[PDB]
Amino acid sequence: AVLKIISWNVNGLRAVHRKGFLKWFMEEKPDILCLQEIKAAPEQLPRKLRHVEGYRSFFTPAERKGYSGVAMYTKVPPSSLREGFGVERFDTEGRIQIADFDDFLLYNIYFPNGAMSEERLKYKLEFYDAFLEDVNRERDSGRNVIICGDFNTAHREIDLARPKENSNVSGFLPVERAWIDKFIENGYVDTFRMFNSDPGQYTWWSYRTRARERNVGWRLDYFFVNEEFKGKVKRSWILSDVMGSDHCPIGLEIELLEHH
Numbered sequence: 709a710v711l712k713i714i715s716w717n718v719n720g721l722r723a724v725h726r727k728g729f730l731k732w733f734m735e736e737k738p739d740i741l742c743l744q745e746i747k748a749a750p751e752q753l754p755r756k757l758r759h760v761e762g763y764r765s766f767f768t769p770a771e772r773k774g775y776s777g778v779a780m781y782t783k784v785p786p787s788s789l790r791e792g793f794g795v796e797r798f799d800t801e802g803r804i805q806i807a808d809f810d811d812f813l814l815y816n817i818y819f820p821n822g823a824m825s826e827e828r829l830k831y832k833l834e835f836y837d838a839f840l841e842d843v844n845r846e847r848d849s850g851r852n853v854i855i856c857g858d859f860n861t862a863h864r865e866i867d868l869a870r871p872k873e874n875s876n877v878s879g880f881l882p883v884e885r886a887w888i889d890k891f892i893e894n895g896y897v898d899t900f901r902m903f904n905s906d907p908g909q910y911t912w913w914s915y916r917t918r919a920r921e922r923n924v925g926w927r928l929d930y931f932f933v934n935e936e937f938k939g940k941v942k943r944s945w946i947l948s949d950v951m952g953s954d955h956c957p958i959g960l961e962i963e964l965l966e967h968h
């Protein structure tokens with residue numbers, strides 16, 4: 709038996725609602741849906757977005773109005789939900805959900821965009837370091853972990869359409885790519901690349917004339933697992949045809965643990 713988990717940066721939950729989000733959600737039927745960039749006060753969402761039949765929903769908004777925010781809809785209730793790393797400046801931006809599903813912890817993370825300033829690039833890299841300390845603590849205690857969301861970095865040249873022109877911009881800086889190398893070396897696996905070694909596999913396209921149509925994109929959105937759990941990953945894919953955001957959704961199917 710498997711669970712289908714989807715991750716999607718929706719570029720505003722109300723915005724994607726107006727384009728057909730609930731119809732997509734009903735057709736795709738994920739067991740767990742992780743969203744990034746909700747951008748809304750949960751009590752200002754229409755009640756048909758706030759609560760969807762068959763799911764429990766959890767919203768973790770930023771302090772700043774209209775900014776960031778993550779959400780999770782799940783057909784099975786988690787046993788707990790942790791919304792921070794325990795560091796105030798990383799925990800007030802609506803970026804972190806860590807849901808305990810007993811088989812695994814599920815991290816749904818909106819990692820910072822560092823492109824607007826050196827200040828925010830430094831915040832991104834420090835957030836990366838706090839995340840790595842957190843997941844290692846949980847993994848080392850004996851938990852399996854699934855990490856999904858918008859990492860805001862394309863790992864290798866194959867992961868964006870125009871690597872050479874982006875050497876010096878956040879999203880493809882050597883130091884950001886090197887952090888992903890370090891995360892993987894700490895015993896985590898980029899699940900998409902377990903199954904797909906092809907070029908042109910992107911999850912974000914700038915909201916500009918025909919960029920998506922021309923597939924001028926970046927792979928910014930990932931599903932990682934700890935190494936010891938990778939044999940339970942059965943599929944990891946990109947839902948590239950699903951419109952409505954500047955990112956598309958990505959999927960993971962994970963087999964349930966089979967106790968003996």
Ligand SMILES: [Mg+2]
Nearest residue numbers: 717719745954
């Ligand atoms: Mg965005």
